[PDB]
């Protein structure tokens, strides 16, 4: 199904796991809580190699990736398990994550409103495919939305995905639904998290900022509803092509996604429908 790489092959293609960043001539692209991401080159093809630093998340990623293949899901090419180290090889996303592009990391120009609308639609198509295949992502966030050579949105990181209550609460607190913080596992929690992503797209602001008032982005929904502020006051100033009608239409979707009561949230098919009507 996927290519079985030996640890020595991934060792050489990543220039002996060169921990220096890409900008300084190394191979390190970044790091997460479960491992370091390296740029690799296998037979004239660029790859992303995640060296895990745990086995259940390796197995779950492979299991979900074998079952779910879609235009808006990142593709797994292979893996390595022969050593004491576990590696996952993916299709390389030249435009990194949506979080990095919204923050203009490493001098990248701001995303236009037109590109932002296409990204939101693509991400919704990806979540829709996961839910149609009875999978809950559990960690929907802008850092988990990757961008290819045409800025096509690709949902990533299926290590926490589930095919209901849990004793092990996992995810990113700033994006998590109230019931998800309580231990509930439901596809409606993915909808809430997508609502936070839509707010990041409109504002260009991260979900959480400790040196900001309010610290959490989902709290701007309260300020707008209580008439303290408007969505117009929060529109990313780094755009020149945003129109009030489509911004209000995306905000309306985000607002519906961010309902505290999980049953009042729209399903992903409705979210997909509202985002298509927006354009």
Ligand X SMILES: CN(C)[C@H]1CC[C@H](Nc2ncnc3[nH]cc(C4CCOCC4)c23)CC1
Residue ranges binding ligand X (CB under 6 A) = 29-30, 37, 48, 50, 74, 90, 92-93, 96-97, 100, 146, 156-157
Nearer to ligand X, 65 or 202 (CB): 65
Q: What is the smallest separation between the CB atom of 89 and ligand X, expressed in angstroms?
A: 9
User: Is residue 30 part of an annotated ligand binding site?
Assistant: yes
Nearer to ligand X, 37 or 278 (CB): 37
Q: Please indicate whether residue 139 is annotated as part of the active site.
A: yes
User: Is residue 143 part of an annotated ligand binding site?
Assistant: yes
Three-state SS string across the chain, please? CCEECCHHHHHHHCCCCCCCEHHHCCCEEEECCCEEEEEEEECCEEEEEEEECCHHHHHHHHHHHHHCCCCCECCEEEEECCCCCEEEEEECCCCCEHHHHHCCHHHCCCCCHHHHHHHHHHHHHHHHHHHHCCCECCCCCHHHEEECCCCCEEECCCCCCECCECCCCCCCCCCCCHHHHCCECCHHHHHHHHHHHHHHHHHCCCCECCCCCCCEHHHHHHHHHCCCCCHHHHCCCCCCCCCHHHHHHHHHHHHHHCCCCHHHCCCHHHHHHHHHHHC
User: Is residue 157 part of an annotated ligand binding site?
Assistant: yes
Nearer to ligand X, 98 or 258 (CB): 98
User: Is residue 48 part of an annotated ligand binding site?
Assistant: no
Nearer to ligand X, 141 or 221 (CB): 141
Q: What is the smallest separation between the CB atom of 230 and ligand X, expressed in angstroms?
A: 32
Q: What is the smallest separation between the CB atom of 7 and ligand X, expressed in angstroms?
A: 18
User: Is residue 248 part of an annotated ligand binding site?
Assistant: no
Evaluated on CA atoms 261, 264, 265, 267, the torsion sign reads positive
Phi, psi dihedrals of residue 173, rounded to the nearest 5°: -45, -45
Of the candidates 59, 82, 139, 148, the residue annotated as catalytic is 139
Q: What does the alpha-carbon distance between residue 225 and residue 143 come to, in Å, rounded to a whole number?
A: 28
Nearer to ligand X, 65 or 253 (CB): 65
Q: What is the smallest separation between the CB atom of 32 and ligand X, expressed in angstroms?
A: 6
Phi, psi dihedrals of residue 151, rounded to the nearest 5°: 60, 30
Q: Which residue is nearest to ligand X (CB)?
A: 30
Q: What is the smallest separation between the CB atom of 61 and ligand X, expressed in angstroms?
A: 8
User: Is residue 35 part of an annotated ligand binding site?
Assistant: yes
Which residues are identified as catalytic? 139
Q: Which residues are annotated as a binding site for ATP?
A: 29-37, 50, 141-144, 157
Q: Which residues are annotated as a binding site?
A: 29-37, 50, 141-144, 157
């Amino acid at each position: 199904r996927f290519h079985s790489f030996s640890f020595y092959e991934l060792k050489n293609v990543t220039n002996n796991f060169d921990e220096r960043p890409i900008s300084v001539g190394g191979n390190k692209m970044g790091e997460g809580g479960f491992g370091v991401v390296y740029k690799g080159y296998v037979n004239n093809t660029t790859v992303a190699v995640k060296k895990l630093a745990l086995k259940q998340q390796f197995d779950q990623e492979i299991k979900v990736m074998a079952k779910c293949q879609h235009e808006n899901l990142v593709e797994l090419l292979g893996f390595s398990s022969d050593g004491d180290d576990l590696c996952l090889v993916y299709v390389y996303m030249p435009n990194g994550s949506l979080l990095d592009r919204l923050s203009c990391l490493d001098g990248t120009p701001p995303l236009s409103w037109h590109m932002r609308c296409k990204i939101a639609q693509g991400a919704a198509n990806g979540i829709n495919f996961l839910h149609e295949n009875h999978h809950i992502h559990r960690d929907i966030k802008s850092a988990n939305i990757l961008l290819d050579e045409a800025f096509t949105a690709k949902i990533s990181d299926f290590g926490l995905a589930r095919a209901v209550m849990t004793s092990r609460i996992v995810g990113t607190t700033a994006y998590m639904a109230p019931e998800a913080l309580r231990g509930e596992i439901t596809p409606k929690s993915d909808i809430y998290s997508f609502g936070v992503v839509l707010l990041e797209i409109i504002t260009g602001l991260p979900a959480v900022d400790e040196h900001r008032e309010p610290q959490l982005l989902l709290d701007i929904k309260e300020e707008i509803e209580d008439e303290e502020k408007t969505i117009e006051d929060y529109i990313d100033k780094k755009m020149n092509d945003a129109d009030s009608t489509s911004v209000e239409a995306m905000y309306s979707v985000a607002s519906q996604c961010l309902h505290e009561k999980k049953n009042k949230r729209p399903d992903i098919k409705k979210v997909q429908q509202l985002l298509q009507e927006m354009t």
